[PDB]
Every structure is written in structure tokens, then in C-alpha cells.
């Protein structure tokens, strides 16, 4: 149902990446150390190149953005908010677009527990010029991870 | 429309920081609407010349080295017909693996390629990491076109591209004869009998 | 289009009373800066601006979470959404858009009523030294840059010092870019 | 379902054919199509390499597209670790790799799994016209744009037979 | 009924007079900068301003915590008259007992700031009334890192000095100055504690 969940900031950093080794109701993952950063660079560059070629190919006035990228095995689902903060999500087949869940996370978990957390920041940047893509920092909030592993767990 | 005749792909390969991308922008159309480099890796640039009353379109793919894209680059040399190994005379460790780039590019590019070798940043000629006569010799027993580019004068690199497209042209120059289409007669009133 | 969806968000949002709270809260935290500096008034504007910045930068993600909006680019669209579904959602009021520039750049933001200076009378020593609702310039300067614009806001006049209206003359100076995810190889 | 633009790219990156069908607009100058086609070849390469804890059947049918027809029986595909279908709001992009490596790209102005089933039975019927009318062509060298003018109004009839 | 505005801008206003308190004490006049119309304003934001209180000199922290109850004092003694105009029946100014104004505050103030009652109230009969609420509203959304739960209570301890000032203000509306302390006091099923003096 769900293989992996990722966030990307405005300043081109993966900041959250829940992977499921065996999927199912529960699994292991979230190690940025085990080449998760290299996978994030591949995931980001893919979505950035396809988001770049969509705006050159978009007639109309309200330009569009990626809704899903299939492959022969899995799918990529996106929700690119206007503040430059991208929810990508790698899934299985036999079920339609997860855009309702992907805005439910933004409307009930991220703004509930990260942006309205005021101990931890919203920028997620130490504040240097080595934060353009090349620095790595993580929010790690205890209540955020608990409810985010709680909600996706029925979708095995 | 499009109306060109042939289309070649030419890789630019080397170590990182040897100065390939600044070499690419000065001599050819650039920054059209390309998203950038590193987002997908290996930026693409285009150059349109004509040889022998045929129109030639050349796409130059400056390969990017970041260790992360090393697996991706292999697949990008598939079908690559023109090639250019770039090295800088100031630094010296690029020439230790320039031969390795040639070996990797003789592998899985085409049946036959035409690899040039170009010395960027000859503005720092006084800072010569490797002698030009050794690289000239190493081009001579590897059948390679050899160039020294100032990076302040674009005439040398432009001349190199024109001659490289000539040598790769005659290599693939398919024979052509004529398309005149002038043979007309037979305007009658058709006394047919079947 | 918008004003239907603004009332649609005014049917599923958590509400409380705008009188007897929040004018109290903002007036108490401007009375603290009045007494904390120790009765100097051209400094409290440059602390309320620097506080409104930090309260706007986190508000913008809540506002994009409530209503699904794209990244606004021209000043037709920002001026439409600020008058129709930002101030209507958060503060129940709506402004109006006059004093439009040449070349689609710098406009004014006349506020009809104001639930920050509501039922406040301002003392005579700050007729020409204080801006009262200068958390609003903080939320606009620290909120419009977070949709990757770059702006400048300032009050021009206020009801407390002057018969003319409360208006903010927001200026577009430049539009910022998106950055490419490495320096180089 | 529907198709608005045929794009045929090579086995080595840059494209050899495109013909916007009733687009009535030219958003991209002809030169851009080359960097778009090379970008699709690159992201088709990249979408191989990321794949999650998987490592584990694409059987279309005959829907009678185009009105005898070209084939009768369910068949297979040839790419699994690779890009197959992009989906956005204005359009939807299908892509189809052959076994030899020759990708066919179809941009679709009709949006919102059965679209795969109707899509690849059209993108194999453009592959049969490619192998019938461009391969038997001694003026056509390999690795060259498709300058034949029979291939255009052999595929225009089948796509206006679709939509 | 009444004219209304949204709770999510008020609660986010209510969370952050403590960065305002350290920006008023530390800035008497890594820090950053911004500009306006031929000016500049030197900015410091909230994550790098509550964390100057984990490294606070002890007279500086205790100088800050008087200001939080001073804010609460001003909003309480300004709030009590408008809650009198709401209803506030059957109590007096000198007010010889204390439970009838502790029945007032949990039903009448704490609904108008937080929407519910103080759900527990314990009666020491010599004048120490315990006011316990289980899920306090502005501290619904604060958490530290991956199981570093010891070092966050002492980090977040300025944030309870607003309802010191609230109950100072609504009792200085009824006459006098008192003494106040706070607790944490976790629940029994799916806390905070205030005294009276």
C-alpha cells in the first residue's frame, strides 16, 4: 500500500523519510544514514525535472503540477504546496489517487505539530549558505512521528 | 519546422572541476530553457552546423560527476557517437584518470567513436601541471584530435568542433545521389481497350 | 470562485469572540512595549514589525493548509486573495483595493473596520510617533515572502492619528527565484 | 484514451519524430523538443534505479482501435523498472518502450489504469506503422529524423479514427 | 451571536509573548537582519530565542518571569469588567468567601480563553484552592526530540506564567494582591495545577 513517505523543503533538503522494509501494518526504516540521502537526491531531481517540463508544456492560465508518476511496478504521488514543500509518496497499484490523504497530512499533522510547534523551527535550516542542497538537519518531534506512523498504518 | 538532416550526440566527459561547463557556454547556443545541471544530471546543449550541403544538428551532453550519478552516467553513454575528454593543465590528477575515461568510453558507446582531447584553462599556461607534448603524444597513439583552449579565446574550440563533426560525418556520411524529379509526358485523351 | 469558498471556510473553522479578547491581548502587548522601553514610541514600531514577521512566517502554512491555493505571481492575484480569502478567513473583515499604480505594482489596502485598534483611544503623546496596528505590516512582510515573493509594506495613515483611513501601501520590488539543488559537481 | 501529440524518440536520447495534432499553438520552439526528449530519456533511466523493498502482468486486449486490424491476442510489455505514465491536470503523458529500446511518447489532452489498456493498444499500432513504413525505406538511414512524408498521413488517419 | 474571529490566529498569538519577553529584556537596544524604506531592523526568531533561556543567568530569567505575569495581570484586570458585562451574577467586591469566585472563574473566564472548565477544584478550607485542568490548550502542540523528555519541561516552564497573571488580574479586580505557584501534575487516564492565597 505504502512503501515510503518523504518531505522536501524549499531549500532542497529531504527532512523526513519513512521507509517500510516489509510494509504490512508495521515495519522498520527512517535511517537517513543508510543512503536515504542519495535516494532523496534521485527522488528530488526526478520531481524537479518533471515539474520543470510541466510548466513549459502548460497552456491555460493556472499552470499545473505533477499529480502522479507511474512506473511498471509502483507509483509516485505528489502534493506540491505553494510554499515550496512537497509531499511525495511511493505506493502500490489497485487504488486511485491519494490526494485526499496527502492534504489530510498537511491539514492535520504538519500544521498541527511542526509549524505550530514553536520550540522547533519551520525553516528546518541552520541558516547558512551550505543549506542550498548540501546540508542535512531533521526536525524530529516526538508527537509528530507517533501520529504519522499511526495514521498510515491501516494502509499496509 | 525542423528541416535538419542528421543529428549526432557528443558527450563531454572528464573529472569534476576541470572546467567543462564554462567551456561549453562560450562557443555554443546555451541557456535556452534547460532546467539546469545536477537536477537530473548531464545538461544538454545544441549546435547547428552544415557540412557538404547537408545540415548537421549536434547535441552536447556535459556529463556530471558527483559519485551519486555514476550508475546513471553509464546508461547515458549508450549510443554516444562523438566524444570529448576535457582536462585542465593547472591541476594534475585529472590526467591520471583521463586514460580511465577513454577506456570506459571505448566500452559501451558505439561500435566506433571519434574522441577528442582538449586542454582547458590555458590562460594559466605558466601553471602547467602536465607538459603539452606528452598529451599530444598520448593523443597520437590513441587516434584522437588534440586541442589547447585559452577559455578567453573561443576560436580554437570552435575549430575543433567543426573538424570533429567532419571526421564523424564522413564516418557516417550515407551515400546520396539525387532527387531531381523531372520526367513528364503522356497527356492524351485515352483510347483505352482492356 | 473565492468569496463562496471564504464563507465555506467560515463554516468549518474554530471561532471565539473578537470583542473582549484579542484587542485586549494586542493592546496589552503594546502597553508593555510602551512601558518596557519606558515611554518612547518610535522604537515600538520596530519591535512590533519584528514580532509580526515571526508570527506571519508560521501563519502562511496554516493559510495554505486551510485553502488549497497555488503560488501567486502577479499582483492581480495576491491583491484578490488578500481582499477576499485571507483577511476574511482569519479576521472576519475584508479590505478594499484602491490607489493602483502604473505597471501593476504598488497598491493600497484600505481597511474598513479594524479588529486590532477596535475601541482604542490613543494618548496625546503619540499623535506623531506611533503606528498602532503595525503587527499587520509584520504579517504581510513576513508572509508574502514565504510564497517566494519579496515585498515592502508600510502604513500611510490611521484613524487614531488622522481622519483618513487605515491603509498599507504594499510595494512589489522584486520576485525571488527557486534555487538549484547543489552549487556544482 | 485520447492522443494530441505523437513524439517518437530514439534509442540514444534525442528525438526523431514529433507532430502536434490539432494543437493550434506553438508553446515550445522546435529546438526545445530535443531537450524535452533527452529529459524523458534521462528520467526513464533514473526511474529504474530507485525502487523500494520490492524485487518480486501487463496483459492488454483487443479493443478495436482504428476505424481488419493489426493484431488479435493479449501480449506482454518489456519495461518494468522504468517510467510508464505521467499524470497531471492539463494533460497526461503515456510512454511505451519497445524491446529494442525505441520509446514512443504520446501526450494526451484528456485527463483522469484502463487508459493504459487503451493507450498501449494504440502505441503498438503506431509501432507497426513505424516498422512497416520507415524500416523499408532506403532513403532513410539509421539514426536520423523521420523525413518521410508517408508516415504522417498513415498515422493521421488512425488517430482521427480514434478521436 | 457576538462578532467573532478565528481561534488559530489567537492561540498562535498567545503562544509567543515569551519570545517577546526575551526580545524585550535581552534587546534593551547568531542574529539576523532585514530592511524597510531606508532602514533596517535586526531580527531574531523564536527557536533561537527560547533557547537563550536554557542558557539563562538566574537574575535574567527571574526578571523575565515577572513580565509574563505582568502581561497576564493586564489582560486579566482588563478582561474581568467585560466578563462582568457578560453576566457575572451573585458575588461581591470584598467577597468574604472564596469558592463562589472559584466557581466563577472556571465557568466564566476559562471558557472565554480556552473553551472549557477547569475540571478539578480541591478545597483546603483555610484558603488554598487547587485548580486542575488536564489538557491545557496552548501546550497541545509542543514536543522535543527523540526521547529527550526530561530537558523539555524545564525548557517550556515559562509558558505557564500567563495563567499566573490571569488569576492575579481577576482577583485584583476583586480587591487585593495574592501569591501564586504552578505545577504540572499528570493525569490518570486519557496536567496543570494552580493554588490560591
In chain B, what are the domain boundaries? 6-172
Q: How far is CA A92 from the centre of its chain?
A: 16
Chain E, residues 137-156, CB within 8 A of chain A, namely 141-147, 149, 152, 155-156
The helix/strand/coil state of B83 is strand
Residue C141 near residue C168, CB atoms below 8 Å:
no
Residue with cell 583552449: B149
Inter-CA distances, D21 with A26, C140, D25, Å: 49, 46, 10
Distance CA E5, CA E8 (A): 9
Tell me, letter by letter, the H, E, C secondary structure of chain C. Answer: CCHHHHHHHCCCCCEEECCCCCHHHHHHHHHHHHHHHCCCCCCCHHHHHHHHHHHHHCHHHHHHHHCCCCCCCCCCHHHHHHHHHHHHHHHCCCEEEECCCCCCCCEEEEECCCCCCCCCCCCHHHCCCCCCCCCHHHHHHHHHHHHCEEEECCEEECCCCCCCCEEEEEEEEEECCCCCCCCCC
CB atoms A142 and E155 under 8 Å? no
The partner residue sitting opposite C61, judged by closest CB among A63, A83, A132, is A83
DSSP H or E run through D87: strand D83-87
Q: How far is CA C156 from the centre of its chain?
A: 13
Task: Kindly tell me the sign of the dihedral angle through the C-alpha atoms of E69, E74, E75, E77.
Answer: positive
> In 3D, which of B180, B82, B81, B92 has the Cα closest to residue B129?
B92
Q: Give, as one character, the DSSP assignment of residue B130.
A: S
Inter-CA distances, E196 with A32, B76, C163, C182, E128, Å: 50, 76, 48, 59, 5
Cα angle, residue A116 at apex, residues A111 and A119 outer, rounded to 5°: 135
Cβ-defined contacts of B183-187 (< 8 Å, 24+): none
Distance CA D71, CA C167 (A): 71
Exposure string for B176-185, b = 16+ CB within 10 A, e = fewer: eeeeeeeeee
> In 3D, which of D66, D63, D19 has the Cα closest to residue D160?
D66
CA distance A132 to chain C (A): 6
A73 Cβ contact partners less than 8 Å away, ≥ 6 residues apart:
D51, D54, D80, D81
> In 3D, which of C144, A148, C58 has the Cα closest to residue E8?
C58
CB contacts, 8 Å: A99 with chain D: none
> In 3D, which of D73, D55, D127, D140 has the Cα closest to residue D95?
D127
A122 Cβ contact partners less than 8 Å away, ≥ 6 residues apart:
A114, A115, C57, C58, C61
Fold of the domain spanning B6-172? Rossmann fold (3.40.50)
Cβ atoms within 10 Å, residue A63: 17
Residue B60 near residue B45, CB atoms below 8 Å:
yes
Residue A11 near residue A126, CB atoms below 8 Å:
no
Chain B, residues 9-28, CB within 8 A of chain D, namely 9
Residue with cell 575528454: B85
- The pair phi, psi for residue B73, each rounded to 5°, is -60, -40
Distance CA C109, CA C100 (A): 10
Residue E80 near residue E172, CB atoms below 8 Å:
no
Distance CA B173, CA B166 (A): 10
Tally of residues, chain C: 185
> In 3D, which of B51, A54, E156 has the Cα closest to residue D90?
A54
Mutate to test the interface with A, among E33, E138, E143, E152 (most CBs of A within 10 A): E143
CA distance D3 to chain A (A): 15
Residue with cell 508593555: C32
The helix/strand/coil state of D148 is coil
DSSP notation for A75-121 = EEEEEEETTTEEEEEEE-SSS---HHHHHHHIIIIIHHHTSS-SSS-
Q: How far is CA C173 from the centre of its chain?
A: 17
B33 in contact with A at a CB cutoff of 8 Å?
A: yes
Distance CA E108, CA E133 (A): 15
C125 in contact with E at a CB cutoff of 8 Å?
A: no
Is B133 among the annotated ligand-binding positions? no
Tally of residues, chain B: 194
Q: How far is CA E60 from the centre of its chain?
A: 19
> How many Å is the maximal CA-CA distance in chain C?
63
Is B17 among the annotated ligand-binding positions? yes
> In 3D, which of C135, C130, C153, C115 has the Cα closest to residue C37?
C130
Residue C74 near residue C161, CB atoms below 8 Å:
no
Residue E148 near residue E86, CB atoms below 8 Å:
no
Distance CA C172, CA C153 (A): 9
B37 in contact with A at a CB cutoff of 8 Å?
A: no
C110 Cβ contact partners less than 8 Å away, ≥ 6 residues apart:
C95, C96, C97, C98, C165, C166, C167
Strands A68-71 and A75-81: antiparallel
Distance CA C55, CA E13 (A): 7
**Cα separation of the two ends of chain E:** 37
Which residues of B52-171 form beta strands (DSSP E)?
54-62, 82-88, 114-120, 145-148
DSSP notation for D29-78 = -HHHHHHHHHHHHHHHHHHHH---S----------------S--S----S
Cβ atoms within 10 Å, residue A120: 20
Cell of B46: 545544441
A2 Cβ contact partners less than 8 Å away, ≥ 6 residues apart:
A20, A23, A89, A90, A91, A92, A152, A155, A156
Distance CA E50, CA C164 (A): 40
Tell me, letter by letter, the H, E, C secondary structure of chain E. Answer: CCCEEEHHHHHHHHCCHHHHHHHHHCCCCCCEEECCCCCCEEECCHHHCCCCCCCCCHHHHHHHHHHHHHHHHHHHHHHHHHHHHHCCCCCCCCCCCCHHHHHHHHHHCHHHHHCCCCCEEEEECCCEEEEEECCCHHHCCCCCCCCCCHHHHHHHHHHHCHHHHHHHHHHHCCCCCCCCCEECCCCCCCCEEECCC
Residue with cell 484552592: E129
Residue C157 near residue C166, CB atoms below 8 Å:
yes
Residue with cell 531531381: B180
β-partners of residue A81 are: A85
Residue B11 near residue B63, CB atoms below 8 Å:
yes
Distance CA E101, CA E93 (A): 10
Inter-CA distances, E43 with A83, B15, B161, C50, C138, Å: 21, 43, 54, 6, 12
Amino acid at each position: 500500500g505504502i512503501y515510503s513517505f518523504w518531505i522536501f523543503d524549499r531549500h532542497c533538503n529531504c527532512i523526513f523519510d519513512r521507509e517500510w522494509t516489509l510494509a504490512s501494518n508495521s515495519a522498520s526504516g527512517t535511517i537517513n544514514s543508510k543512503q536515504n540521502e542519495e535516494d532523496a537526491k534521485l527522488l528530488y531531481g526526478m520531481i524537479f525535472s518533471l515539474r520543470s517540463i510541466t510548466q513549459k508544456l502548460s497552456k491555460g492560465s493556472v499552470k499545473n503540477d505533477i499529480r502522479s508518476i507511474s512506473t511498471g511496478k509502483y507509483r509516485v504521488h505528489t502534493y506540491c504546496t505553494a510554499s515550496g514543500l512537497w509531499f511525495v509518496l511511493l505506493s502500490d497499484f489497485k487504488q486511485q489517487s491519494y490526494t485526499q490523504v496527502l492534504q489530510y497530512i498537511y491539514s492535520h499533522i504538519y500544521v498541527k505539530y511542526v509549524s505550530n510547534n514553536l520550540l522547533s523551527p519551520y525553516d528546518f535550516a541552520e541558516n547558512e549558505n551550505e543549506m542550498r542542497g548540501q546540508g542535512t538537519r531533521k526536525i524530529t518531534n516526538r508527537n509528530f512521528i507517533s501520529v504519522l506512523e499511526s495514521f498510515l498504518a491501516p494502509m499496509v | 519546422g525542423y528541416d535538419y538532416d542528421y543529428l549526432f550526440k557528443i558527450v563531454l566527459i572528464g573529472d569534476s572541476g576541470v572546467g567543462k561547463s564554462n567551456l561549453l557556454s562560450r562557443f555554443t547556443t546555451d541557456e535556452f530553457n534547460i532546467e539546469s545541471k545536477s537536477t537530473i544530471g548531464v545538461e544538454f546543449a545544441t549546435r547547428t552546423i552544415e557540412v557538404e550541403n547537408k545540415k548537421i544538428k549536434a547535441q552536447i551532453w556535459d556529463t556530471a560527476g558527483q559519485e551519486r550519478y555514476r550508475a546513471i552516467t553509464s546508461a547515458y553513454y549508450r549510443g554516444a557517437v562523438g566524444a570529448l575528454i576535457v582536462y585542465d593543465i593547472s591541476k594534475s590528477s585529472s590526467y591520471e584518470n583521463c586514460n580511465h575515461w577513454l577506456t570506459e568510453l571505448r566500452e559501451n558507446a558505439d561500435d566506433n567513436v571519434a574522441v577528442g582531447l582538449i586542454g582547458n584553462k590555458s590562460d594559466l599556461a605558466h601553471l602547467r601541471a602536465v607538459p603539452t607534448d606528452e598529451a599530444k603524444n598520448f593523443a597520437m597513439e590513441n587516434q584522437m584530435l588534440f586541442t589547447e583552449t585559452s577559455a578567453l579565446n573561443s576560436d580554437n574550440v570552435d575549430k575543433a568542433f567543426r573538424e570533429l563533426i567532419v571526421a564523424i560525418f564522413q564516418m557516417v556520411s550515407k551515400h546520396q545521389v539525387d532527387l531531381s524529379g523531372s520526367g513528364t509526358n503522356n497527356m492524351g485523351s485515352n483510347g483505352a481497350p482492356k | 470562485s473565492l468569496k463562496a469558498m471564504g464563507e465555506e471556510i467560515w463554516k468549518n473553522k474554530t471561532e471565539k469572540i473578537n470583542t473582549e479578547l484579542f484587542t485586549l491581548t494586542y493592546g496589552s502587548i503594546v502597553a508593555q512595549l510602551c512601558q518596557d522601553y519606558e515611554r518612547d514610541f518610535n522604537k515600538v514600531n520596530d519591535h512590533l514589525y519584528s514580532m509580526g514577521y515571526n508570527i506571519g512566517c508560521r501563519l502562511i502554512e496554516d493559510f495554505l493548509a486551510r485553502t488549497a491555493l497555488p503560488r501567486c505571481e502577479n499582483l492581480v492575484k495576491t491583491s484578490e486573495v488578500l481582499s477576499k480569502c485571507a483577511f476574511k478567513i482569519f479576521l472576519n473583515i475584508t479590505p478594499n483595493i484602491t490607489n493602483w499604480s502604473h505597471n501593476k505594482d504598488t497598491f493600497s489596502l484600505i481597511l474598513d473596520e479594524n479588529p486590532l485598534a477596535d475601541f482604542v483611544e490613543l494618548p496625546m503623546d503619540a499623535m506623531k510617533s506611533l503606528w498602532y496596528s503595525n503587527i499587520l505590516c509584520g504579517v504581510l512582510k513576513g508572509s508574502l515572502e514565504m510564497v517566494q515573493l519579496d515585498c515592502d509594506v508600510w502604513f500611510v495613515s490611521d484613524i487614531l492619528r488622522g481622519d483618513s483611513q487605515t491603509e498599507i501601501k504594499v510595494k512589489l520590488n522584486r520576485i525571488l527565484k527557486d534555487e538549484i539543488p547543489i552549487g556544482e559537481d | 484514451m485520447a492522443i494530441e501529440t505523437i513524439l517518437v524518440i530514439n534509442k540514444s536520447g534525442g528525438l526523431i519524430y514529433q507532430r502536434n495534432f490539432t494543437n493550434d499553438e506553438q508553446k515550445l520552439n522546435s529546438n526545445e523538443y530535443l531537450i524535452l526528449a533527452s529529459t524523458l530519456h534521462g528520467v526513464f533511466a533514473i526511474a529504474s534505479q530507485l525502487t523500494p523493498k520490492a524485487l518480486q502482468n501487463t496483459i492488454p486486449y483487443i479493443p478495436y482501435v482504428g476505424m481488419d486490424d493489426f493484431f488479435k491476442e493479449p501480449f506482454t510489455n518489456w519495461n518494468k523498472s522504468g517510467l510508464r505514465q505521467l499524470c497531471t491536470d492539463q494533460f497526461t503523458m503515456f510512454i511505451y518502450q519497445t524491446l529494442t529500446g525505441l520509446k514512443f511518447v504520446a501526450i494526451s489532452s484528456s485527463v483522469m489504469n484502463l487508459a493504459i489498456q487503451i493507450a498501449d493498444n494504440f502505441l503498438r499500432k503506431v509501432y507497426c506503422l513505424y516498422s512497416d513504413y520507415v524500416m523499408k525505406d532506403p532513403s532513410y538511414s539509421m539514426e536520423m529524423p523521420i523525413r518521410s512524408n508517408l508516415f504522417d498521413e498513415k498515422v493521421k488517419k488512425m488517430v482521427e479514427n480514434l478521436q | 451571536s457576538l462578532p467573532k474571529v478565528s481561534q488559530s490566529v489567537y492561540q498562535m498569538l498567545l503562544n509567543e509573548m515569551v519570545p517577546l519577553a526575551m526580545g524585550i529584556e535581552r534587546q534593551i537596544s547568531i542574529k539576523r537582519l532585514k530592511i524597510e524604506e531606508h532602514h533596517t531592523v535586526d531580527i531574531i526568531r523564536s527557536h533561537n530565542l527560547i533557547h537563550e533561556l536554557y542558557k539563562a543567568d538566574e537574575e535574567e530569567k527571574e526578571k523575565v518571569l515577572a513580565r509574563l505575569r505582568n502581561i497576564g495581570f493586564q489582560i486579566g484586570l482588563k478582561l474581568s469588567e467585560l466578563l462582568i458585562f457578560s453576566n457575572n451574577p451573585n458575588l461581591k467586591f470584598k467577597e468574604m468567601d472564596l469558592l463562589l469566585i472559584m466557581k466563577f472563574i472556571c465557568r466564566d473566564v476559562w471558557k472565554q480563553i480556552f473553551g472549557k472548565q477547569i475540571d478539578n477544584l480541591k478545597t483546603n478550607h483555610r484558603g488554598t484552592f487547587y485548580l486542575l485542568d488536564y489538557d491545557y490548550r496552548p501546550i497541545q502542540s509542543f514536543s522535543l526530540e527523540e526521547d529527550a523528555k526530561n530537558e523539555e519541561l524545564k525548557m517550556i516552564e515559562p509558558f505557564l506564567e500567563i495563567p499566573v497573571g490571569i488569576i492575579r488580574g481577576v482577583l485584583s479586580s476583586l480587591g487585593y494582591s495574592s501569591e501564586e505557584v504552578i505545577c504540572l501534575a499528570s493525569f490518570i487516564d486519557r496536567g496543570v495545577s494552580f493554588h490560591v492565597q
